[PDB]
Design an enzyme around this catalytic site. Structure first.
Site, PDB file in Angstrom:
ATOM      1  N   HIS A  66       0.862  -1.141   0.000  1.00 48.08           N
ATOM      2  CA  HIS A  66       0.000   0.000   0.000  1.00 48.08           C
ATOM      3  C   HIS A  66       0.902   1.194   0.000  1.00 48.08           C
ATOM      4  O   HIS A  66       0.345   2.282  -0.173  1.00 48.08           O
ATOM      5  CB  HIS A  66      -0.763  -0.161   1.487  1.00 48.08           C
ATOM      6  CG  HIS A  66      -1.648   1.029   1.748  1.00 48.08           C
ATOM      7  ND1 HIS A  66      -1.221   2.120   2.390  1.00 48.08           N
ATOM      8  CD2 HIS A  66      -2.935   1.284   1.362  1.00 48.08           C
ATOM      9  CE1 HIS A  66      -2.260   3.022   2.449  1.00 48.08           C
ATOM     10  NE2 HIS A  66      -3.310   2.499   1.763  1.00 48.08           N
ATOM     11  N   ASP A  78      -6.358  14.522  -1.063  1.00 45.84           N
ATOM     12  CA  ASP A  78      -5.203  13.710  -0.696  1.00 45.84           C
ATOM     13  C   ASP A  78      -3.949  14.519  -0.988  1.00 45.84           C
ATOM     14  O   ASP A  78      -4.010  15.655  -1.462  1.00 45.84           O
ATOM     15  CB  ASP A  78      -5.259  12.413  -1.501  1.00 45.84           C
ATOM     16  CG  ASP A  78      -4.510  11.240  -0.874  1.00 45.84           C
ATOM     17  OD1 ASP A  78      -3.573  11.411  -0.019  1.00 45.84           O
ATOM     18  OD2 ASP A  78      -4.849  10.088  -1.284  1.00 45.84           O
ATOM     19  N   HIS A 108      -8.160  11.457   2.288  1.00 43.10           N
ATOM     20  CA  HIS A 108      -7.308  10.263   2.299  1.00 43.10           C
ATOM     21  C   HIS A 108      -5.854  10.576   2.604  1.00 43.10           C
ATOM     22  O   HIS A 108      -5.000   9.687   2.461  1.00 43.10           O
ATOM     23  CB  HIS A 108      -7.445   9.624   0.933  1.00 43.10           C
ATOM     24  CG  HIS A 108      -6.877   8.243   0.793  1.00 43.10           C
ATOM     25  ND1 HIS A 108      -5.794   7.981  -0.016  1.00 43.10           N
ATOM     26  CD2 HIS A 108      -7.266   7.050   1.303  1.00 43.10           C
ATOM     27  CE1 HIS A 108      -5.561   6.680  -0.031  1.00 43.10           C
ATOM     28  NE2 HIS A 108      -6.426   6.092   0.775  1.00 43.10           N
ATOM     29  N   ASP A 110       4.084  -0.062   3.835  1.00 44.81           N
ATOM     30  CA  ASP A 110       3.876   1.373   3.616  1.00 44.81           C
ATOM     31  C   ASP A 110       5.218   2.101   3.659  1.00 44.81           C
ATOM     32  O   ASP A 110       6.257   1.524   4.016  1.00 44.81           O
ATOM     33  CB  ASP A 110       2.884   1.923   4.638  1.00 44.81           C
ATOM     34  CG  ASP A 110       1.451   1.715   4.250  1.00 44.81           C
ATOM     35  OD1 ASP A 110       1.099   2.136   3.128  1.00 44.81           O
ATOM     36  OD2 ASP A 110       0.633   1.231   5.062  1.00 44.81           O
TER      37      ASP A 110
HETATM   38  P1  LIG Z   1      -4.809   3.160   1.540  1.00 47.27           P
HETATM   39  O1  LIG Z   1      -5.646   1.934   1.764  1.00 47.27           O
HETATM   40  O2  LIG Z   1      -4.872   3.630   0.103  1.00 47.27           O
HETATM   41  O3  LIG Z   1      -4.913   4.217   2.597  1.00 47.27           O
END
Ligand SMILES: *[PH-](=O)([O-])[O-]
Length: 496
Positions: free
Chosen positions: A163, A195, A430, A455
């Site tokens: 992600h 975002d 987001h 991440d």
């Molecule tokens: P992610 O599931 O994009 O924040």
């Protein structure tokens, strides 16, 4: 020190994850926030960037984002390294990538290109289809390009897959943040998701390349395991686990004077522990985060998980470093349980400790009226939790409420005077953004809500950049979002 916030975060990471230093986290000097001459804050790749307008007519943010993708890729001479969350890039995001690759190829360059997505887990044709679509769209440029495309899942039971959202070129430039390359949610809509990414250059872009080599090393090792990896390559090209190390300098060239900590996480299913770590956490307790008794809580109750996921500790340490004020902009602070615990106890404890000491905390989350882009029904699910953690250190519930209402701003997001977009849909947010002291900020893909994913992001200590972030994003956000606040110390609001 000129960098008190990074100094504290760095010390934490060397205790939590020393064996991952260089690869999954790295402190570097000599970076630059990569803005234009005309608008030096436009390193801040927010989308849509249509503040004040419920019709979002002039999307200066989106335009800059797409242009900057193409610009960076079109400057490639060796490597283009992309990660995101599936689906693979489409619409104008894909157009931007293709335009960039053609631009680089026409400049005479021969490129290696990796595109990695995480996905939920027989005969996944998606990677091969995306490879073939990209190759067709490239035209003659395809002759200059060695392509690797993959989708991966590292743990089905822990819901772990990539992600991170990263675009690195030549190890020199990097774009990263929250933005998935999804045309329907971000672009072709009158209720675009709000975002943010950042654009930088320097050694820290090399840190992102080493993170991607870590993910691709696992991906290539597991490419024969269906259910884990679906891989596709141009021609007779192999999988490139170490494209970055193989092709770009170990330390990228310096471009400015900005200090940065790159930090990511390996989720679950790549590596179970950092064997070099001697981290001994003091883990808190709570009775309201693990909604069911059978859930194994990696966020709150798994020391080994922390050691291979330094980003959780980094974000908590960033909060703990604040002397004056903290602004948090997220989709959510809380997760849906099961299968995740409801919240990160150490995070809420760190925010409580700050408020108890008179440090101001602002949390803006996505409107619950969006509930994929929200995981709560009410802001009370955040304020009740903060109050209960505050009670542990202020001597009770009444003193907790007072501390909270004296030091908290808590609201849902708006970008114009309207409670919703003009098309009637709620605003979805987001970002994965934390800023402290108008000094040091995180922009990346790591949500503050419990999540066990791969991440990545950057923690940047640069007061000038933090001030640009205030003016261009945090200030307009609060201008419009404050109308939804249930707690706002600055106006004496305490409806919680
Ligand atoms: P992610 O599931 O994009 O924040």
């Amino acid at each position: 020190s000129a960098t008190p916030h990074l100094d504290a975060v760095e010390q934490t990471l060397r205790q939590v994850s020393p064996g991952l230093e260089g690869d999954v986290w790295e402190r570097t000097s000599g970076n630059k926030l990569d803005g234009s001459a005309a608008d030096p804050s436009d390193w801040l790749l927010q989308t849509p960037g249509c503040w004040g307008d419920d019709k979002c007519a002039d999307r200066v943010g989106t335009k800059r984002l797409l242009a900057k993708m193409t610009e960076n890729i079109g400057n490639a001479t060796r490597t283009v390294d992309i990660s995101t969350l599936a689906p693979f890039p489409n619409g104008a995001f894909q157009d931007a990538i293709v335009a960039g690759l053609k631009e680089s190829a026409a400049k005479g360059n021969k490129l290696k290109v990796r595109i990695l997505v995480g996905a939920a887990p027989h005969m996944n044709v998606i990677p091969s289809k995306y490879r073939d679509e990209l190759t067709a769209k490239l035209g003659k440029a395809a002759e200059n390009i060695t392509l690797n495309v993959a989708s991966m899942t590292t743990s089905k039971t822990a819901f772990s897959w990539n992600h991170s959202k990263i675009l690195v070129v030549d190890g020199q430039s990097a774009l990263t943040g929250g933005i998935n390359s999804w045309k329907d949610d971000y672009l072709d809509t009158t209720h675009p998701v709000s975002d943010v990414d950042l654009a930088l250059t320097g050694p820290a872009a090399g840190s992102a390349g080493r993170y991607l080599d870590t993910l691709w090393t696992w991906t290539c090792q597991n490419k024969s395991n269906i259910a884990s990896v679906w891989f596709a390559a141009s021609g007779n090209a192999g999988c490139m686990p170490t494209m970055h190390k193989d092709t770009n300098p170990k330390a990228s060239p310096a471009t400015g004077n900005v200090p940065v900590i790159a930090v990511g996480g390996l989720g679950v299913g790549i590596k179970d522990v950092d064997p070099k770590s001697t981290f001994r956490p003091d883990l808190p307790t709570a009775s309201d985060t693990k909604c069911v008794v059978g859930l194994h809580d990696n966020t709150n109750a798994d020391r080994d998980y922390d050691t291979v996921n330094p980003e959780e500790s980094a974000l908590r340490a960033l909060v703990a470093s604040a002397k004056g004020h903290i602004e948090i902009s997220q989709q959510d602070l809380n997760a849906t349980c099961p299968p995740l615990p409801r919240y990160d106890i150490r995070l809420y404890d760190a925010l409580a400790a700050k408020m108890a000491a008179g440090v101001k905390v602002r949390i803006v989350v996505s409107d619950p009226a969006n509930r994929g882009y929200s995981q709560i029904k009410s802001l009370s699910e955040i304020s009740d939790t903060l109050r209960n953690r505050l009670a542990n250190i202020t001597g009770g519930q009444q003193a907790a409420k007072t501390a909270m209402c004296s030091n908290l701003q808590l609201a849902t997001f708006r970008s114009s005077p309207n409670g919703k977009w003009a098309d009637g849909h709620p605003y979805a947010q987001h970002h994965k953004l934390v800023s402290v002291d108008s000094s040091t900020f995180y922009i990346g893909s790591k949500n503050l809500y419990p999540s066990w994913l791969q991440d990545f992001g950057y923690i940047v200590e640069s007061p000038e950049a933090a001030k640009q972030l205030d003016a261009k994003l945090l200030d307009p956000q609060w201008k419009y979002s404050q109308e939804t606040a249930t707690v706002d110390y600055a106006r004496g609001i305490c409806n919680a």
